[PDB]
Design a protein around this ligand. Structure first.
Ligand SMILES: O=C(O)CN(CCN(CC(=O)O)CC(=O)O)CC(=O)O
Ligand SMILES: [Fe+3]
Length: 498
C-alpha cells in the first residue's frame, strides 16, 4: 500500500486534547488541530484559519478575519464562535498555561461576527502571533466535543480541522491516523499513518531493520546513534540529519553548594571536552554548543565568549576559589568540604547515562566528584520543578520558542531554569527584564534587553551548554525525501510525497 505508512513513537499519542499537555504528544495534536496563523521557517507567520488581521495603534486589540469555508472533520463549521469558545476553554485553565505569557496577556476574546474574531491583550505583546502558531494550546476542537462546556476536564472525540483524523488508539500498542478527505487545504499524498508504540531506541532500530516500520523521525534519542551512522551508509535505507534545532545543556544550581559559587560554575564550563563527548556518546552526529542559544537563534548573536575545554584553566579557577587537593586525594576540598556535585538524569535513558558518565570523568580530572543520580522520569521532573539538583540535563525548545518563550518561562518558579537561577543576586532584574522584553515595542530596547539577559546568564555560568542537536530520519527509500517542520516539535507528515 504505497500511500500507507507505519512509523513508531515511544508512547501513544494521548487523547488528543488540544488544550492539555502530557500525555498528549505535540506532533499529533498538530496533525489534527490547527492554528489561526501558521509559523514559517523565516520567523514570520502566514494566514491559516485566519485569512487576515489588524490591530489597534496601541497594539492591544487584534481583529482576525477568518476563513469561511472550514469545517471540522465531523462536518460542523469552524467560525469565530467556535474559535472564541476554544480560547475560553484554554483560559479557563489559565494556571496551567503560566509558562506561556500569551495565556496571561489575553484579557478578552469575542466573536464579532461569524468571520470576525477579536482578541484583547493586557499589553502590546510582541510574540503574539508566533504563540498563536504553537502546537498547543491555542488550536481548535469542535465545541461540541467539549465536556460540560469545558476542555480542561477532558474532551469527547478529538475533532479538529486538520489534515489528519485519529482513527483509533490502543494504549501501549498503536495509534492510526487517516487523511481528512474533507480538509479545507491541500490533501496529503499519504492516506494512512500507523504509529507503533515502541519505547526502547534499540527496539525501534530493530523494527526498522525487520521491515515492521517504514519511518523513524525524532531527535537525538530516536535510535542508537551508532546504528544511525551505520544505516546512513546502508544502500537499502535512507537517512537524514537536519540542521540543529535546539540546545542540550546542563543547568547548574546557583542556589546549592558548591554550584552556588561562580568560580565553580566557570570551572565546570572549562572541564568538559564537548567535541569528545559528541564523538564518543553522540557518534559525531551533533554540534558542540558554547552558549545557551546557538548564534543563529533570533536575538542571540551576541559575541558571547566561549569557555573552550581547558582543564588547566578549570583547575586554576578552582584553586583560586580555595578548592584544593588534600594530600593523596583526587577530589578537592574547601573548609574540609569535598567538591561533590550531584548530576541528575533519567536513569533508563541510555544516551543521558552515557553523557553523564563522560561528564563525570572529565570533571574528576579537575578534582570535582560528580555523583550520578539516575532516576525515573517523574522523579527527575520533580527535581527540576523544586530545584532539588546540583546539575541536571535540560534542553531548549526550538523554533518558535527560542528565545522568547524559553526566556519567558525562566520567570516561572516551577521550572528548572528559575530554580537553577534562583541563587543569582540579579535574578529579580533578569525576571524584570524578561517581562519588559516581551512587551516592548522599541526594537532597540528589545535587542538590548535580550543582550542583557543572555549575557548575564552566560557570564554567571548558569548553564553548561553541551550540544546543538538535530532531527534525524530513517526511512524506506520509496518514501522519498522526508521534510522538516518549521516548528521543532512538529512532524510534517502531510508534506511526505513518495
Ligand atoms: O511540557 C509542558 O508541560 C509545557 N512545556 C512548555 C514548553 N513546551 C511546549 C509545550 O509543552 O507545549 C516545549 C516542549 O515541550 O518542547 C514545559 C517544558 O516542556 O519544559
Ligand atoms: Fe513542554
Amino acid at each position: 500500500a504505497p500511500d500507507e505508512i507505519t512509523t513508531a513513537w515511544p508512547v501513544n499519542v494521548g487523547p488528543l486534547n488540544p488544550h492539555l499537555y502530557t500525555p498528549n504528544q505535540m506532533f499529533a495534536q498538530s496533525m489534527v488541530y490547527e492554528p489561526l496563523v501558521k509559523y514559517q521557517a523565516d520567523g514570520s507567520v502566514i494566514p491559516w484559519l485566519a485569512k487576515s488581521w489588524t490591530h489597534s495603534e496601541d497594539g492591544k486589540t487584534w481583529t482576525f478575519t477568518l476563513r469561511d469555508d472550514v469545517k471540522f472533520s465531523n462536518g460542523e463549521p469552524f467560525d469565530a464562535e467556535a474559535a472564541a469558545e476554544n480560547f475560553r476553554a484554554v483560559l479557563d485553565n489559565r494556571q496551567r498555561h503560566a509558562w506561556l505569557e500569551l495565556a496571561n496577556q489575553i484579557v478578552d476574546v469575542k466573536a464579532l461576527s461569524k468571520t470576525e474574531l477579536q482578541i484583547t491583550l493586557k499589553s502590546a505583546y510582541y510574540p503574539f502571533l508566533q504563540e498563536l502558531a504553537l502546537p498547543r494550546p491555542f488550536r481548535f476542537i469542535a465545541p461540541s466535543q467539549f465536556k460540560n462546556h469545558e476542555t480542561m476536564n477532558g474532551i469527547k472525540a478529538p475533532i479538529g480541522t486538520g489534515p489528519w483524523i485519529l482513527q483509533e488508539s490502543k494504549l501501549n500498542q498503536y495509534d492510526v491516523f487517516v487523511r481528512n478527505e474533507n480538509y479545507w487545504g491541500e490533501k496529503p499524498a499519504i492516506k494512512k499513518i500507523t504509529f507503533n508504540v515502541i519505547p526502547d531506541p534499540t527496539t525501534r532500530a530493530v523494527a526498522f531493520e525487520t521491515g515492521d516500520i517504514d519511518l523513524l523521525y525524532g531527535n537525538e534519542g530516536l535510535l542508537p546513534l551508532d546504528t544511525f551512522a551505520r544505516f546512513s551508509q546502508n544502500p537499502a535505507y535512507h537517512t537524514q540529519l537536519s540542521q540543529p534545532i535546539e540546545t542540550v545543556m546542563l543547568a547548574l544550581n546557583t542556589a546549592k553548594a558548591p554550584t552556588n559559587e561562580l568560580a565553580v560554575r566557570e570551572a565546570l564550563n572549562y572541564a568538559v571536552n564537548k567535541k569528545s563527548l559528541i564523538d564518543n556518546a553522540l557518534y559525531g552526529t551533533q554540534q558542540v554548543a558554547d552558549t545557551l542559544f546557538a548564534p543563529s537563534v533570533p536575538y542571540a548573536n551576541l559575541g558571547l565568549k566561549p569557555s573552550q575545554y581547558d582543564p588547566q584553566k578549570a583547575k586554576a579557577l578552582l584553586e583560586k576559589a580555595g578548592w584544593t587537593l588534600p594530600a593523596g586525594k583526587d577530589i578537592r576540598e574547601k573548609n574540609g568540604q569535598p567538591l561533590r556535585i550531584e548530576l541528575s538524569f533519567i536513569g533508563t535513558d541510555a544516551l543521558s547515562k552515557s553523557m553523564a558518565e563522560i561528564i563525570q570523568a572529565d570533571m574528576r580530572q579537575i578534582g570535582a566528584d560528580v555523583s550520578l543520580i539516575g532516576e525515573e522520569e517523574s522523579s527527575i521532573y520533580a527535581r527540576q520543578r523544586d530545584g532539588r539538583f546540583g546539575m541536571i540535563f535540560h534542553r531548549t525548545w526550538g523554533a518558535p520558542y527560542d528565545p522568547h518563550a524559553f526566556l519567558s518561562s525562566m520567570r516561572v518558579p516551577s521550572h528548572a531554569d528559575f530554580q537553577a537561577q534562583q541563587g543569582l543576586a540579579d535574578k529579580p532584574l533578569i525576571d524584570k527584564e524578561i517581562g519588559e522584553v516581551l512587551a516592548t515595542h522599541d526594537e532597540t530596547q528589545r535587542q538590548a534587553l535580550y543582550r542583557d539577559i543572555l549575557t548575564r546568564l552566560h557570564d554567571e555560568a548558569v548553564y553548561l551548554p553541551i550540544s546543538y542537536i538535530s532531527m534525524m530520519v530513517v526511512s524506506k527509500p520509496e518514501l522519498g525525501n522526508i521534510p522538516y517542520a518549521p516548528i521543532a516539535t512538529e512532524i510534517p507528515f502531510e508534506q511526505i510525497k513518495p
